[PDB]
Design an enzyme around this catalytic site. Sequence first.
Site, PDB file in Angstrom:
ATOM      1  N   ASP A  84     -23.058  18.313  -9.138  1.00 60.15           N
ATOM      2  CA  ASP A  84     -21.862  17.707  -9.729  1.00 60.15           C
ATOM      3  C   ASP A  84     -22.127  16.992 -11.047  1.00 60.15           C
ATOM      4  OD1 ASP A  84     -18.983  16.743  -9.368  1.00 60.15           O
ATOM      5  OD2 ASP A  84     -20.045  14.838  -9.391  1.00 60.15           O
ATOM      6  N   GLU A 109     -22.769  22.173 -12.420  1.00 60.45           N
ATOM      7  CA  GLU A 109     -21.420  22.066 -12.964  1.00 60.45           C
ATOM      8  C   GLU A 109     -21.441  21.584 -14.427  1.00 60.45           C
ATOM      9  OE1 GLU A 109     -18.902  18.805 -12.353  1.00 60.45           O
ATOM     10  OE2 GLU A 109     -17.116  19.906 -12.892  1.00 60.45           O
TER      11      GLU A 109
HETATM   12  C1  LIG Z   1     -13.486   5.697 -11.747  1.00 58.44           C
HETATM   13  C2  LIG Z   1     -12.507   6.874 -11.743  1.00 58.44           C
HETATM   14  O1  LIG Z   1     -12.399   7.428 -10.423  1.00 58.44           O
HETATM   15  C3  LIG Z   1     -11.585   8.585 -10.355  1.00 58.44           C
HETATM   16  O2  LIG Z   1     -12.106   9.649 -11.106  1.00 58.44           O
HETATM   17  C4  LIG Z   1     -12.125  10.947 -10.470  1.00 58.44           C
HETATM   18  C5  LIG Z   1     -11.599  12.114 -11.255  1.00 58.44           C
HETATM   19  O3  LIG Z   1     -10.254  11.818 -11.625  1.00 58.44           O
HETATM   20  C6  LIG Z   1     -11.647  13.380 -10.505  1.00 58.44           C
HETATM   21  O4  LIG Z   1     -11.520  14.480 -11.414  1.00 58.44           O
HETATM   22  C7  LIG Z   1     -12.872  13.618  -9.538  1.00 58.44           C
HETATM   23  O5  LIG Z   1     -13.775  14.389 -10.408  1.00 58.44           O
HETATM   24  C8  LIG Z   1     -15.175  14.807  -9.979  1.00 58.44           C
HETATM   25  C9  LIG Z   1     -16.342  14.329 -10.730  1.00 58.44           C
HETATM   26  C10 LIG Z   1     -16.771  12.894 -10.563  1.00 58.44           C
HETATM   27  O6  LIG Z   1     -17.876  13.028  -9.671  1.00 58.44           O
HETATM   28  C11 LIG Z   1     -17.207  15.234 -11.579  1.00 58.44           C
HETATM   29  C12 LIG Z   1     -16.836  16.692 -11.637  1.00 58.44           C
HETATM   30  N1  LIG Z   1     -15.948  17.232 -12.658  1.00 58.44           N
HETATM   31  C13 LIG Z   1     -15.954  16.498 -13.910  1.00 58.44           C
HETATM   32  C14 LIG Z   1     -16.963  16.995 -14.920  1.00 58.44           C
HETATM   33  O7  LIG Z   1     -18.251  16.997 -14.328  1.00 58.44           O
HETATM   34  C15 LIG Z   1     -16.950  16.076 -16.150  1.00 58.44           C
HETATM   35  O8  LIG Z   1     -17.743  16.651 -17.170  1.00 58.44           O
HETATM   36  C16 LIG Z   1     -15.528  15.885 -16.701  1.00 58.44           C
HETATM   37  O9  LIG Z   1     -15.152  17.022 -17.414  1.00 58.44           O
HETATM   38  C17 LIG Z   1     -14.710  16.799 -18.744  1.00 58.44           C
HETATM   39  C18 LIG Z   1     -15.535  17.862 -19.452  1.00 58.44           C
HETATM   40  O10 LIG Z   1     -16.914  17.534 -19.389  1.00 58.44           O
HETATM   41  C19 LIG Z   1     -15.073  17.960 -20.889  1.00 58.44           C
HETATM   42  O11 LIG Z   1     -15.818  18.936 -21.591  1.00 58.44           O
HETATM   43  C20 LIG Z   1     -13.622  18.356 -20.865  1.00 58.44           C
HETATM   44  O12 LIG Z   1     -13.155  18.546 -22.154  1.00 58.44           O
HETATM   45  O13 LIG Z   1     -12.857  17.320 -20.249  1.00 58.44           O
HETATM   46  C21 LIG Z   1     -13.217  17.112 -18.869  1.00 58.44           C
HETATM   47  C22 LIG Z   1     -12.325  16.003 -18.344  1.00 58.44           C
HETATM   48  O14 LIG Z   1     -10.953  16.282 -18.601  1.00 58.44           O
HETATM   49  O15 LIG Z   1     -14.592  15.565 -15.669  1.00 58.44           O
HETATM   50  C23 LIG Z   1     -14.577  16.497 -14.572  1.00 58.44           C
HETATM   51  C24 LIG Z   1     -13.475  16.117 -13.582  1.00 58.44           C
HETATM   52  C25 LIG Z   1     -16.304  17.005 -10.239  1.00 58.44           C
HETATM   53  O16 LIG Z   1     -16.147  18.402 -10.088  1.00 58.44           O
HETATM   54  C26 LIG Z   1     -14.976  16.317  -9.979  1.00 58.44           C
HETATM   55  O17 LIG Z   1     -14.494  16.736  -8.715  1.00 58.44           O
HETATM   56  O18 LIG Z   1     -13.568  12.377  -9.162  1.00 58.44           O
HETATM   57  C27 LIG Z   1     -13.559  11.287 -10.031  1.00 58.44           C
HETATM   58  C28 LIG Z   1     -14.157  10.158  -9.244  1.00 58.44           C
HETATM   59  O19 LIG Z   1     -13.335   9.821  -8.134  1.00 58.44           O
HETATM   60  C29 LIG Z   1     -10.163   8.239 -10.827  1.00 58.44           C
HETATM   61  O20 LIG Z   1      -9.323   9.391 -10.795  1.00 58.44           O
HETATM   62  C30 LIG Z   1     -10.214   7.674 -12.235  1.00 58.44           C
HETATM   63  O21 LIG Z   1      -8.914   7.294 -12.658  1.00 58.44           O
HETATM   64  C31 LIG Z   1     -11.123   6.459 -12.233  1.00 58.44           C
HETATM   65  O22 LIG Z   1     -11.209   5.942 -13.553  1.00 58.44           O
HETATM   66 CL   LIG Z   2     -17.534  23.622  -9.803  1.00 54.87          CL
END
Ligand SMILES: C[C@H]1O[C@H](O[C@H]2[C@H](O)[C@@H](O)[C@@H](O[C@@H]3C(CO)=C[C@H](N[C@H]4[C@H](O)[C@@H](O)[C@@H](O[C@H]5[C@H](O)[C@@H](O)[C@H](O)O[C@@H]5CO)O[C@@H]4C)[C@H](O)[C@H]3O)O[C@@H]2CO)[C@H](O)[C@@H](O)[C@@H]1O
Ligand SMILES: [Cl-]
Length: 496
Positions: A197, A233
């Site tokens: 993750d 991921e």
């Molecule tokens: C403190 C906050 O808690 C809650 O956040 C949650 C997210 O809302 C929710 O999506 C879910 O997400 C998981 C996590 C966290 O472990 C990581 C994975 N997916 C991520 C990815 O790894 C990240 O890189 C990022 O992606 C970015 C891209 O990197 C970027 O290139 C692109 O342009 O934008 C995206 C973001 O839009 O975010 C991804 C979701 C997991 O697969 C995913 O399941 O969990 C967290 C934690 O509960 C809460 O919703 C927030 O409001 C709080 O601030």
């Molecule tokens: Cl994935």
Amino acid sequence: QYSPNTQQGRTSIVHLFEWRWVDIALECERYLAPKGFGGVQVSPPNENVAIYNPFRPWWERYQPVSYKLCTRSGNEDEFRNMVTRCNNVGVRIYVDAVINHMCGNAVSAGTSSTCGSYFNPGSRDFPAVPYSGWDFNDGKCKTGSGDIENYNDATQVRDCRLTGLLDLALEKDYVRSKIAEYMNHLIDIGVAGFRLDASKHMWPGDIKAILDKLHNLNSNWFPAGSKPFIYQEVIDLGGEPIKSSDYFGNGRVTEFKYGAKLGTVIRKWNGEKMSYLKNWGEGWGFVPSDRALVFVDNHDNQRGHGAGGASILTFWDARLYKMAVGFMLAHPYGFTRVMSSYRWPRQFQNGNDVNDWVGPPNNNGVIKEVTINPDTTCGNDWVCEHRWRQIRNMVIFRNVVDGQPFTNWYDNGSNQVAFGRGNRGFIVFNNDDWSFSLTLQTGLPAGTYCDVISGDKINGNCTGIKIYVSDDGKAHFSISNSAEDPFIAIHAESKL
Ligand SMILES: C[C@H]1O[C@H](O[C@H]2[C@H](O)[C@@H](O)[C@@H](O[C@@H]3C(CO)=C[C@H](N[C@H]4[C@H](O)[C@@H](O)[C@@H](O[C@H]5[C@H](O)[C@@H](O)[C@H](O)O[C@@H]5CO)O[C@@H]4C)[C@H](O)[C@H]3O)O[C@@H]2CO)[C@H](O)[C@@H](O)[C@@H]1O
Ligand SMILES: [Cl-]
Ligand SMILES: [Ca+2]
């Protein structure tokens, strides 16, 4: 870390999102094994914070509190029981490893956790592990907010908090050791690999450091010297300092351009058309097939979270979804992951689903059991796309044609295409606004084949459409643009 470790002839894994361990165990025996599924990606098995506002969202599981195997999916014994029963029937388990962070720095301290463990986000005390203030990247991050503000800055992406989640200091050997300890506990129970993750938020080298500390797979089920399958991921569409190629040394990577581009094409948006898929794969700027983990949609983007946007096809767009998933499973590029979801009350307001946080079907927080209807579909709000005939049969199509080359491609210059896989399978699609009716070269041996999309080959007959391949491998195909499923697929094992 590149081999999935599945049984020979099993080419796909299913994400049984938010399912209970006991239901996965049963699913392995009654369905996954007999239908040829290679493995299951399970939701994070470690203790997480119980978030009550909103009420137990799916995302609370990405906020670790400890490494105790105690969640809404079940306790340690239930987890161990599942891995054992599944392995015993040849279906592998891949664990979603949440190792880049702990919970949100702004969650209240106390014992609002799935296993009752005490935690204090404010003072960075996670006594269950244990981790303390000294194990986080607070002193490393150089952003005003302490959170990631600029994705064009690679160091920020790795040392600062992703959305406020307490970022672990993965360069520390103590932290690396605690994570490796958790992972090794899982390896010994019998897991075949991991989904790492938020890998983009970790340095390739720290991931390497943790992986070096891992045991080989359990020798009761795997050959000696077996290494866990690793898929990271990393959301890498164009335009970022972090490239997915930076992670090839550790294992495979999620290819997010795959579903984003396939969706645009099936939806026929941006002037895209199915005939353009003739060179699908690396030809589209995707990572090497040998390093890819592909999927149409995942748990985040079928909801608006993560990346993909509006083009992403989901179970909600069932007709186009079955076609996209079918194309994915028939095409030789990458290792395929199928999605299995639960229905939620999607409620859009200004282009946003205000209920995108809704967790799995439950009765006052307790996850509801997966019930199976007389027709083999699921009840209790579970979608079970993996049980839809068109999807499950394509999962079998992939197994049958494994190793065979992409050949006999046809296209009408628009949205009517067909292609085969050696002499073992042939698929036809009609995504145009008019009917397809043409005699094509299939490369298959003469005979009557049951179409596995409309029916099944059951005891010497077909329950759906029958295709007749002549001695020269030619076969006539008719598909109305108004068909329920505007695609036909036949293979070596559906032949009467
Ligand atoms: C403190 C906050 O808690 C809650 O956040 C949650 C997210 O809302 C929710 O999506 C879910 O997400 C998981 C996590 C966290 O472990 C990581 C994975 N997916 C991520 C990815 O790894 C990240 O890189 C990022 O992606 C970015 C891209 O990197 C970027 O290139 C692109 O342009 O934008 C995206 C973001 O839009 O975010 C991804 C979701 C997991 O697969 C995913 O399941 O969990 C967290 C934690 O509960 C809460 O919703 C927030 O409001 C709080 O601030
Ligand atoms: Cl994935
Ligand atoms: Ca980090």
